[PDB]
Design a protein around this ligand. Structure first.
Ligand SMILES: COC1=C(OC)C(=O)C(C/C=C(\C)CC/C=C(\C)CC/C=C(\C)CC/C=C(/C)CC/C=C(\C)CC/C=C(\C)CC/C=C(\C)CC/C=C(/C)CCC=C(C)C)=C(C)C1=O
Ligand SMILES: CCCCCCCCCCCCCCCCCC(=O)OC[C@H](COP(=O)([O-])OCC[N+](C)(C)C)OC(=O)CCCCCCCCCCCCCCCCC
Ligand SMILES: CCCCCCCCCCCCCCCCCC(=O)OC[C@H](COP(=O)([O-])OCC[N+](C)(C)C)OC(=O)CCCCCCCCCCCCCCCCC
Ligand SMILES: CCCCCCCCCCCCCCCCCC(=O)OC[C@H](COP(=O)(O)OCCN)OC(=O)CCCCCCCCCCCCCCCCC
Ligand SMILES: CCCCCCCCCCCCCCCCCC(=O)OC[C@H](COP(=O)(O)OCCN)OC(=O)CCCCCCCCCCCCCCCCC
Ligand code: SF4
Ligand code: SF4
Ligand code: SF4
Lengths: 87, 360, 178, 80, 115, 171, 68, 318, 156
């Protein structure tokens, strides 16, 4: 196992490559999350950063940098403003 | 439990596909063909593409043809896995379903990576394929194919020599060759009773004339024979996948005739002719010469045919899809004679049917 | 070329050893034991299931998901009411009504997609001349009432704003292939 | 007609084994040397009180005590 | 007393479970919910029409074989007999008769099913 | 525990009356299975184990076949239960009350001759070999294999010829 | 892996061992340290009845030795 | 105290069945390359109770065409017999020492068929009738050979009492003298429990559900509970008859533990087979039995009548 | 604390049972049934969440309308819904079922299953990804998690 990030929300991500255990069964590689809640029923869309989901689903090759997410927090918040001016 | 008479009552999935298509442009009608035989989507759309190209007098590029055959054979693996595994589940044996649906999931991954949709892809279009293969897809397909043999061998170890499977399938739903031809059966239904026939060989299309493979042929014309043919056909399709992987040629993916194929987006944002062509193609769509044609392909279920009628306008005049299951399931009453309800449950599987194509 | 799957072979292949082999196979359920062994072999393998909600399956840059309306980086809305997406949509889900704004530009007073009539084909993002309408990577948007699936312009623009970074990354990854 | 039996052993083994074990069941009791001992053991198993017999003086063989040497002995069972 | 007690407790447990099941859940009863089931389309006839049995001959043969099992069951006590020759001979005769009857019904295509 | 065997016998009479009123064969078979169970209990109370267990086993099989045949051949659109027809229901209740009245009448008229509701249960089991070993009905029924061999011969021939007879009848 | 089958199987095993142990211990406790006597035959029932009548407490398990 | 013994024999058995459901689902999952239940509690240990609750709290149904009497009786009878059959078993000391324990088991199990039969008739539906008549065929198959199998092993046991089997197998398993009988017994138990491959009385594919098509909620729960109690009971019967455990008069708990191990292994084997094999066609089931098991079973019955006589090994009565 | 507290906990237990064990009926009408099968497949494994398929509507809870709802089919779907025992829920998957979908303007297709039955969760797509259907199932579990039936009775 490895740690990769602990976002603002609280979720903790891990990366786990391929290893073969006692008899060498060959456990397959994984990209996992550990959420703010450990109950599946209580999982709602948007509980995960949109950027982080990408690396979880392999669309994004390498893990995000928290600053990269921080920028996304900027643009998203104030993009709704600049469109109010430009009618 | 003797079945005296079988009276199928179809049409419970009829949606007026053929009438709807008359109000949609040819490209607008392409997605309808994904919805027909929903376990052989790419083969269906390949049939439609071949028909429309025949009418237009246009020829898809070599790389497009090779990709189309590659994904047609992958789709055949999908359909044959579905048929064999759901037949096994219907009989009673259940583990092969999960074992091979894992592989089906991997194959849907390939589908999505090349098209963006797991199924109902709408990838193969008249004039070639929508987009070129993403980098690495061929390597991943090779990795899948190099191991699919173990999975198929394990399923065969499960069912082929099983005494229970042999008792529940062998000598069930015997169909003679002459009756097969007369009733109009096609594909594996013919090749199980022993008629030597396969459109990929007798009436080649695409690059099928340049790929080498064997056509499994039955002997006793029963459910066991047909199941064996389906398994061996999956093996032959793996062979063809290897050939295509080694024979993929370089070039473009859609006919470089912007009056039938949409222009590249980058060019569309620079060249006036490309912009006009993009506009008219995605609005009015290309115009097909007045004519009528019938094209058939060896879809994983059988001979999938479309009888397209064009009146010189951007919209088709009449599109009649020959589902290979429509002729098959009609012969259910003939096949299930002197057999009990369990044997009927089994015979339904061998016909290898999806009511999407049956009802259209 | 053909190959018989189940051709009957020889009827005269008769020996005491062979008859004993056949009788042993019949009486001792040899093939059945072999199948049991195969199933046991499977038992001890790694399960292939993914802990779904906290581990999601692979998705490519070309994934066709929830339609979204992008914005120009300044803040301007990219869509210029060309209506090609409406003209091409196979299922006739998009309905657009546009007017000339004060400046004189094209802008859509209403842009509505009926997501219960949409077939997620992607022909809209295919034919959008300014890359305005894009089908985002999102796939989780099941609603509790039918009226929430009738997306409107505000909902689409909010989706675009929310998924801008990933939509942008996928577009950069894919545009060469397009 | 060895071919008939041998083809039977190849195609319908169950009937062959059934008939063979049936024949063995019929035969073995005659062949076996221990068959005699079954009835002797069953008689030995003493399930009723051995009613004594009045001693009239004309009964040499019948014993007067269980531990006397006379009468039936079960050593043949003791080391059967 | 003990067998009665245990079986009565079993009966009471089953009945209590049935009563809980029938008196706890909320009940909404209407005709469509209460009508028979046939795979989505209403029934075309009653379920009490004659339902021909294709194994009637083997049903009656099962009666006869059950009675012959009846004749066989005393063997564990019988084997304790002192007339072992007679016991074994009679048991062999009975089993042979059973086998020959089965063989006749087999060769007369009796164990097969009518069509 | 004194009225145990009498209660079992009365329940047997009730079951047999239900059978006599000839309801639909399905419910007749149900009542017959109940009667067989009651008879098994009666035999066990009298101390015979094998015989009672034996009727139970044999008749579970027999009434299974009876079920098969009745549902294949002896069926109406509206099978009639005991309560389906007031005629049958009234004669069922009448049988119960009349049998009770007869029991009371015999009790009063002669308290010892036939029914003795006084001292009921006193005269069940008469003698027992307290120190005996083999007394169970299994040994007696095993006598067939040693002494009453003619009996088993006739029974076995009955079954053997029965096979041929049913084959030809059903032909 | 396959280790996760074992939990429920452990609950199985405990619930299937409890009956035999429980009945054995109850028999010993309620018959005074000796496992319940079995009356397969009228002779054994007679012996048990004699023991009950000789106990003086009307319990067959209460035993009397040479001291009596 | 007998009531405490009743509780200690019933509550653990009901719990064992409850968790047998979960064990089946998880073993099938891990054998099909999936994880099976694993959310409802740690490793899915609460799933059986969750499902039991849901079933007992879902509406119970009384279809208008049903014979309410038998419709309510048959499930109750099924559960009653399922629980009752556990009574005579020696593990090692039985709750109720019946001299004719095996005959008791045979009669009660044979009565269990009437639950299926009456339920299928009372449902007054076509699929229910199909299921009832298929149950008729299954019984006609298994019983005739079951009885002879038990007789053949009893000729060496010496008596019909189950407790005698422990002393008989004090030195070896009955399996070694009679593995041929044991395999037919195993397949016959498979058939009797209506379990796969012989899962015809509820063939979810052919018939949506057999006898239990119109049964929902608690009644259906009772049928399922009886089924999975009978599975454990038959595997226990096999463990006792053949596969004899170890008896050391000083250490009964050793017998108890060995019995639990062997019964658990065989019950798991049932699920193993379920996942491995397809289903029979009930005609083929009947032919299998009558035309393969029955001849060999009869021949072995004669063989085992002979063997005591010509080996001078007749067992002791008592 | 109060009868309200005990009733709330009882309701929580009720809903925990119902949501942890919900058995979809084997209903599938078109392509979308294939994605339902994949959701059943090993990779996602519905059983892991306690979800298991049952054939008889009498023994089901949730009806997953997967595929187009043709006019000919509508009566059968309505009757199987009615024959399901209460409490019962309806999950609509795919455009075919949420609305008319691709075939919305056709003469045979009923424009949405919600017209024939009361729907609980609408899962969009064409076909909705197996992952999407799994998310819809979790949403239905949340819906059950908030029920307050016993509380509403006690306050009633
Ligand atoms: C459309 C088609 C597709 C999507 C393909 C999908 C797959 C299929 C069609 C095949 C899938 C279905 C099947 C193969 C059959 C389903 C069955 C299985 C997977 C395995 C067996 C599991 C089943 C039937 C679930 C049963 C679970 C239960 C809990 C049943 C009820 C059990 C009980 C009520 C026992 C509980 C009792 C207790 C807790 C009592 C405890 C008592 C005390 C503590 C005193
Ligand atoms: C065994 C009993 C055999 C001897 C005859 C029994 C006589 C007493 C029956 C009392 C009257 C009941 C009746 O009328 O039958 C109607 C019923 C049929 O009723 P139904 O099918 O019409 O449904 C009634 C519907 N409602 C409620 C709306 C009116 O049949 C029975 O009662 C027989 C049930 C078996 C009784 C024996 C139980 C033994 C335990 C199982 C073994
Ligand atoms: C070993 C595990 C297996 C255990 C199985 C046993 C389960 C035991 C469950 C105990 C919980 C008891 C509450 C169950 C309520 C189920 C029915 C229901 O929800 O209706 C509530 C009902 C409904 O109340 P209501 O009448 O106000 O609701 C509205 C009514 N209609 C629909 C007509 C408008 O309330 C009760 O009466 C429940 C109180 C029972 C005490
Ligand atoms: C020394 C002198 C005296 C010696 C006496 C001894 C003589 C030797 C006797 C040897 C014979 C042993 C008994 C064998 C019984 C087997 C019956 C049989 O022949 O097989 C029947 C069937 C085979 O299939 P089928 O082709 O239909 O048979 C007819 C062919 N014409 O086979 C089947 O029924 C299989 C279908 C059911 C499958 C059920 C799944 C079982 C899975 C394997 C179980 C493994 C564990 C078994 C052990 C259990 C232990 C308790
Ligand atoms: C919804 C409907 C539910 C219906 C439930 C019906 C339950 C039926 C359960 C199946 C019972 C079938 C088998 C018959 C009972 C067994 C009888 C028996 O064999 O033994 C009785 C027993 C004597 O046996 P034994 O001890 O070996 O000999 C004396 C020396 N000890 O000692 C006895 O004499 C006891 C006699 C009573 C036996 C129990 C009967 C209970 C019936 C309750 C009704
Ligand atoms: S994805 Fe296709 S069906 Fe959906 S809105 Fe876009 S063009 Fe229309
Ligand atoms: S195609 Fe693009 S620019 Fe044209 S109307 Fe649609 S979203 Fe706007
Ligand atoms: S919603 Fe789309 S994928 Fe699903 S059945 Fe309909 S056309 Fe096929």
């Amino acid at each position: 196992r490895e740690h990769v990030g602990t976002d603002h929300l609280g979720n903790k991500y891990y990366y786990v490559a391929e290893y073969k255990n006692w008899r060498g069964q060959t456990i397959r590689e994984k990209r996992i999350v550990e959420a703010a809640n450990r109950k599946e029923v209580d999982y709602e869309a948007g509980d995960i950063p949109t950027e982080w989901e990408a690396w979880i689903r392999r669309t994004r090759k390498t893990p995000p940098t928290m600053e990269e997410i921080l920028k996304n927090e900027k643009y998203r918040e104030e993009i709704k403003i600049k469109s109010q001016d430009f009618y | 439990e003797m079945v005296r008479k079988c009276d199928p009552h179809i049409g419970l999935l009829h949606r007026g596909t053929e009438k709807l298509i008359e109000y949609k442009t040819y490209l607008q009608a392409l997605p309808y063909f994904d919805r027909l035989d929903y376990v052989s989507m790419m083969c269906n759309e390949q049939a439609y593409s071949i028909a429309v190209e025949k009418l237009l007098n246009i020829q898809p590029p070599p790389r497009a043809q090779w990709i189309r055959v590659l994904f047609g054979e992958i789709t055949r693996i999908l359909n044959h896995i579905m048929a064999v595994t759901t037949h096994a589940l219907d009989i009673g044996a259940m583990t092969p379903f999960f074992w091979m649906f894992e592989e089906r999931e991997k194959m849907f991954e390939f589908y999505e990576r090349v098209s963006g949709a797991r199924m109902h892809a709408a990838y193969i279009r008249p004039g070639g394929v929508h987009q070129d293969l993403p980098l690495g897809l061929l390597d991943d397909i090779y990795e899948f194919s190099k191991n699919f043999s173990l999975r198929i061998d394990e399923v065969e170890e499960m069912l082929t020599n099983n005494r229970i499977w042999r008792n529940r399938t062998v000598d069930i739903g015997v169909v003679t060759a002459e009756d097969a031809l007369n009733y109009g059966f096609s594909g594996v239904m013919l090749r199980g009773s022993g008629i030597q026939w396969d459109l990929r060989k007798t009436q080649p299309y695409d690059v099928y004339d340049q790929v080498e493979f064997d056509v499994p042929i039955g002997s006793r014309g029963d459910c066991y024979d047909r199941y064996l043919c389906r398994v061996e056909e999956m093996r032959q399709s793996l062979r063809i996948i290897e050939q295509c992987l080694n024979k993929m040629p370089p070039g473009e993916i859609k006919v470089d005739d912007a009056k039938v194929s949409p222009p590249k987006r980058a060019e569309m944002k620079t060249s006036m002719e490309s912009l006009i062509h993009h506009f008219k193609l995605y609005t009015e769509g290309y115009q097909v010469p007045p004519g009528a044609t019938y094209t058939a392909i060896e879809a994983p279920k059988g001979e999938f045919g479309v009888y397209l009628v064009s009146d010189g306008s951007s919209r088709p005049y009449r599109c009649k899809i020959k589902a290979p299951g429509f002729a098959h399931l009609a012969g259910l009453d003939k096949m299930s004679k002197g057999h009990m309800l369990a044997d009927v449950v089994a015979i339904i599987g061998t016909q290898d049917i999806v009511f999407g194509e049956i009802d259209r | 070329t053909y190959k018989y799957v189940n051709k009957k072979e020889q009827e005269s292949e008769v020996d005491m050893k062979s008859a004993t082999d056949n009788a042993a196979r019949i009486l001792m359920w040899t093939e059945l034991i072999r199948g049991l062994g195969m199933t046991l072999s499977y038992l001890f393998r790694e399960p292939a299931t993914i802990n779904y909600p906290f581990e999601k399956g692979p998705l490519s840059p070309r994934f066709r998901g929830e339609h979204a309306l992008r914005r120009y980086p300044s803040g301007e809305e990219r869509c210029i009411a060309c209506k090609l997406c409406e003209a091409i949509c196979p299922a006739q889900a998009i309905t657009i009504e546009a007017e000339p704004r004060a400046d004189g530009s094209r802008r859509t007073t209403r842009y509505d997609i009926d997501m219960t009539k949409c077939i997620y084909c992607g022909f809209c993002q295919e034919a959008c001349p300014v890359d305005a309408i894009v089908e985002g990577p999102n796939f989780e948007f099941s609603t509790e009432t039918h009226e929430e699936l009738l997306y409107n312009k505000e909902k689409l623009l909010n989706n675009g704003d929310k998924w801008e970074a990933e939509i942008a990354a996928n577009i950069q990854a894919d545009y060469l292939y397009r | 007609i060895s071919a008939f039996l041998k083809n039977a052993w190849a195609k319908e083994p169950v009937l062959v084994v059934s008939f063979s074990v049936w024949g063995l069941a019929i035969i073995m009791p005659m062949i076996s040397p221990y068959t005699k001992y079954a009835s002797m053991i069953n008689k030995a198993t003493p399930y009723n009180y051995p009613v004594p017999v009045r001693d009239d003086g004309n009964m040499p063989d019948v014993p007067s005590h269980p531990q006397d040497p006379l009468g039936p002995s079960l050593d043949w069972l003791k080391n059967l | 007393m003990n067998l009665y007690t245990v079986i009565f407790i079993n009966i009471l447990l089953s009945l209590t479970l049935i009563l809980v099941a029938f008196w706890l859940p909320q009940m909404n009863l209407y005709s469509e919910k209460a009508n028979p089931y046939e795979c989505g389309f209403d029934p075309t006839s009653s379920a009490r029409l004659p339902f021909s049995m294709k194994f009637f001959l083997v049903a009656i043969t099962f009666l006869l074989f059950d009675l012959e099992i009846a004749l066989l069951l005393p063997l564990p006590w019988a084997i304790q007999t002192i007339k072992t020759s007679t016991m074994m001979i009679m048991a062999f005769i009975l089993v042979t008769i059973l086998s020959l009857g089965l063989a006749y019904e087999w060769t007369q295509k009796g164990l097969e099913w009518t069509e | 525990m004194n009225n145990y065997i009498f209660v079992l016998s009365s329940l047997f009479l009730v079951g047999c009356l239900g059978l006599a009123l000839k309801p639909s064969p399905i419910y007749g078979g149900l009542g017959l299975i109940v009667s067989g169970f009651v008879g098994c209990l009666m035999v066990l109370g009298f101390g015979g184990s094998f015989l009672g267990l034996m009727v139970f086993l044999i008749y579970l099989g027999g009434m299974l076949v009876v079920f098969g045949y009745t549902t294949a051949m002896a069926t109406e659109e509206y099978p009639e239960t005991w309560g389906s027809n007031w005629l049958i229901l009234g004669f069922l209740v009448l049988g119960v009350i009349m049998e009770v009245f007869l029991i009371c009448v015999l009790n009063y008229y002669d308290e010892v001759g036939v029914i003795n509701l006084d001292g009921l249960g006193d005269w069940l089991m008469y003698e027992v070999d307290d120190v005996g070993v083999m007394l169970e009905g299994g040994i007696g029924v095993a006598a067939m294999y040693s002494c009453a061999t003619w009996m088993m011969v006739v029974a076995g021939w009955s079954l053997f010829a029965g096979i041929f007879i049913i084959i030809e009848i059903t032909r | 892996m396959w280790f996760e089958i074992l939990p429920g199987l452990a609950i199985m095993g405990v619930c299937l061992v409890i009956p035999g142990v429980s009945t054995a211990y109850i028999h010993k406790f309620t018959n005074g340290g000796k496992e319940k006597r079995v009356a397969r035959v009228q002779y054994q029932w007679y012996l048990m009845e004699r023991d009950r009548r000789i106990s003086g407490v009307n319990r067959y398990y209460v035993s009397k030795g040479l001291e009596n | 105290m007998f009531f405490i013994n009743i509780l200690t024999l019933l509550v653990p058995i009901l719990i064992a069945m409850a968790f047998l459901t979960l064990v089946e689902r998880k073993i099938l999952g891990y054998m099909q390359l999936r994880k099976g239940p694993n959310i409802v509690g740690p490793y899915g240990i609460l799933q059986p109770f969750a499902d039991a609750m849901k079933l007992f709290m879902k509406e119970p149904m009384r279809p208008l065409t049903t014979s309410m009497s038998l419709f309510i009786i048959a499930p109750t009878l099924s559960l009653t017999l399922a629980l009752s059959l556990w009574v005579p078993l020696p593990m090692p000391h039985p709750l109720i020492n019946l001299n004719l324990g095996i005959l008791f088991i045979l009669a009660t199990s044979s009565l269990s068929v009437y639950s299926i039969l009456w339920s299928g008739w009372a449902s007054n539906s076509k699929y229910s009738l199909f299921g009832a008549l298929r149950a008729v065929a299954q019984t006609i198959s298994y019983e005739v050979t079951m009885a002879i199998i038990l007789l053949s092993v009893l000729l060496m046991n010496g008596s019909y009492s189950l407790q005698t089997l422990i002393t008989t197998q004090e030195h070896m398993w009955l399996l070694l003298p009679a593995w041929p009988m044991a395999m037919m017994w195993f397949i016959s138990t498979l058939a009797e429990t209506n379990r796969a491959p012989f899962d015809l009385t509820e063939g979810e594919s052919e018939l949506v559900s057999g006898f239990n098509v119109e049964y929902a909620a608690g009644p259906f729960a009772l049928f399922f509970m009886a089924e999975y109690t009978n599975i454990i009971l038959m595997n226990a019967l096999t463990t006792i008859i053949f596969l004899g455990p170890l008896y050391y008069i000083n250490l009964p708990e050793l017998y108890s533990t060995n019995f639990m191990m062997e019964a658990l292994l065989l019950s798991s084997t049932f699920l193993w087979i379920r996942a491995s094999y397809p289903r029979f066609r009930y005609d083929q089931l009947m032919h299998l039995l009558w035309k393969n098991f029955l001849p060999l079973t009869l021949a072995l019955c004669m063989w085992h009548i002979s063997l005591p006589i010509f080996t001078a090994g007749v067992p002791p009565y008592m | 604390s109060r009868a309200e507290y005990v009733v709330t906990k009882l309701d929580d237990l009720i809903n925990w049972a119902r949501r942890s064990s919900l058995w979809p009926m084997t209903f599938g009408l078109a392509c979308c049934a294939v994605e339902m099968m994949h959701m059943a497949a090993p990779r996602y494994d519905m059983d892991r969440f306690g979800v298991v398929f049952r054939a008889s509507p009498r023994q089901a809870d949730v009806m997953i309308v997967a595929g187009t709802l043709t006019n000919k089919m509508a009566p059968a779907l309505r009757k199987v819904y009615d024959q399901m025992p209460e409490p019962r829920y309806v999950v609509s998957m795919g455009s075919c079922a949420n609305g008319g979908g691709y075939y919305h303007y056709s003469y045979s297709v009923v424009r949405g299953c919600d017209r024939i039955v009361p729907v609980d969760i609408y899962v969009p797509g064409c076909p909705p990804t197996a992952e999407a259907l799994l998310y819809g199932i979790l949403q239905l579990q949340r819906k059950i998690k908030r029920e307050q039936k016993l509380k509403i009775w006690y306050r009633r």
